[PDB]
Design a binder for this molecule. Sequence first.
Ligand code: 88Z
Ligand code: 88Z
Lengths: 277, 279
Amino acid sequence: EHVRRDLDPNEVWEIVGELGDGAFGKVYKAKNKETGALAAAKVIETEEELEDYIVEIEILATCDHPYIVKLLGAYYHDGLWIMIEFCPGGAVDAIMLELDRGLTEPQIQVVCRQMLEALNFLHSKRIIHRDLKAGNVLMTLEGDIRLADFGVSAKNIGTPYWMAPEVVMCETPYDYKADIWSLGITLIEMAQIEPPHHELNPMRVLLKIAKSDPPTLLTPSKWSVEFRDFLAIALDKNPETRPSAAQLLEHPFVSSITSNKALRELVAEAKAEVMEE
Amino acid sequence: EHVRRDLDPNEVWEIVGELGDGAFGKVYKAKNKETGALAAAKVIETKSEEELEDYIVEIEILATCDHPYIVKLLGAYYHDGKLWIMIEFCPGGAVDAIMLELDRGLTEPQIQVVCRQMLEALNFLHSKRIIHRDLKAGNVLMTLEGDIRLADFGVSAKNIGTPYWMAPEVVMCEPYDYKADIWSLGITLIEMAQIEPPHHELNPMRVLLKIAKSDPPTLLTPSKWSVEFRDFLAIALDKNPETRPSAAQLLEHPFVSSITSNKALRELVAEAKAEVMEE
Ligand SMILES: COc1cc2c(Oc3ccc(NC(=O)C4(C(=O)Nc5ccc(F)cc5)CC4)cc3F)ccnc2cc1OCCCN1CCOCC1
Ligand SMILES: COc1cc2c(Oc3ccc(NC(=O)C4(C(=O)Nc5ccc(F)cc5)CC4)cc3F)ccnc2cc1OCCCN1CCOCC1
């Protein structure tokens, strides 16, 4: 593996805080002793699990894109550290909570447009995410999005005649359509704070999703028709018919976006509310 | 038994023949130097370290599958970079090899015996949360007495993100997954009836799309076969996993519920044994 394995982290970085006590684990905010560059340290306690994590770092090492979090280093000492470029805005779900309101349609358009640039880049590299949500999209001071994982997702027998129908569908081109659906749900999440069927517990929602009709926004007046159309085309149960990331890029909902000013305003607004006391 | 890794197998067994040069590898016929109980030796040269680790887990799965209709594991050794698997010798051989040597398919009484014993085998595995996933005539061995011994040759197995942001297709893909073997079982009966599996004229790449797009297949010439035969195939070949019947349920079906004798299979083994002596 490429991971630097001969340095104890204390020389390079010093822990300075905790950003969230969370299910994924503890993640600290650190500054480099030499250059003082801000970053986030993901500290994990493991086995073969370490070998499972090693592929995760290599996936991110090759995902060099403006709208994807930048990895600065990885070290393994004192029984594995991950350094990620510090995004001062934080996750969008944390921002929505701090401001106690949903995103505006202009702000959603910017987020939607930048995520499709990220997904089109990932899918072209035969990489799926499978965990798209507001919590996985961080914000910078400049108003840009940096996509993140916060886990161990992101992927990438028998004889043919005697196989079953379910086996051909589940096992083996058109497997990228899952992220497109998750993106459509995230837009509704950022608009209405909570995702569809949030009253239910995780076990029941799975059955609830399959039988039910595709979800739509609650207040159809407030949002544009192109928003509703973009959601309707994105939220399609049939994978074969589901449009790719490239097709949605040429859609009026995001095709005419040239400025990130709307998102830049949000980060400054959320930054100010934090100081209130 | 646990795989011996410091004892050479040559001391224990002596090779006396080759049974098949195959995709899996070389398979020899062996005799125990002490007792001479006869066995089959599957010898594999593991390419990597994780290749070996996958195979040793497979052996441990078979070590716990103690059932009359499943091949018995006798020993496992790893010396000189090769992996040895010791299995009880089945004189009948695989039924697909039998069909070729006899140049004909099995009869409905012979299929009923095979079907009943396989339904007993699958019910035993599924109760232990084990799927097979590679059911075919080549994986069904035969004994002198007329009994079935199920085998793998390949590999079976014993047994993410947030749901709200999930799609419909992931919900289907991601404890009612045991029905796959039932489908492979229904196809194997057609194979033993018609020698060749369904859609054998097509190339292997095309078969995957044909299985899904087409409706479930049925037998070609039903005149020889019963409606009870046709119904059992039709009920087994159901696309929906939730609706597919389990192994215990198919046992309570007249096609195999009224079987008390394995004489039909015993006749098949004796016929094939005699044909070998010819030329
Ligand atoms: C929780 O708050 C924060 C978390 C941060 C952060 O977290 C991580 C994100 C992803 C990974 N991923 C990884 O380590 C990996 C990954 O994500 N791979 C990956 C895979 C596919 C892909 F498309 C993109 C990335 C697994 C490797 C690791 C992280 F540590 C990274 C960078 N800056 C952060 C800033 C945060 O708050 C700043 C604001 C704080 N204030 C807000 C206001 O109130 C007060 C607090
Ligand atoms: C090719 O001919 C033969 C092969 C034989 C044989 O092969 C194997 C079967 C399974 C495994 N499985 C394994 O190594 C494993 C397995 O099967 N596990 C498993 C897992 C789950 C399960 F449900 C069942 C089995 C992987 C461990 C390994 C084997 F080596 C086993 C026993 N007797 C055999 C007799 C053969 O011919 C006798 C007749 C010859 N005549 C033919 C006509 O002309 C004259 C000669």
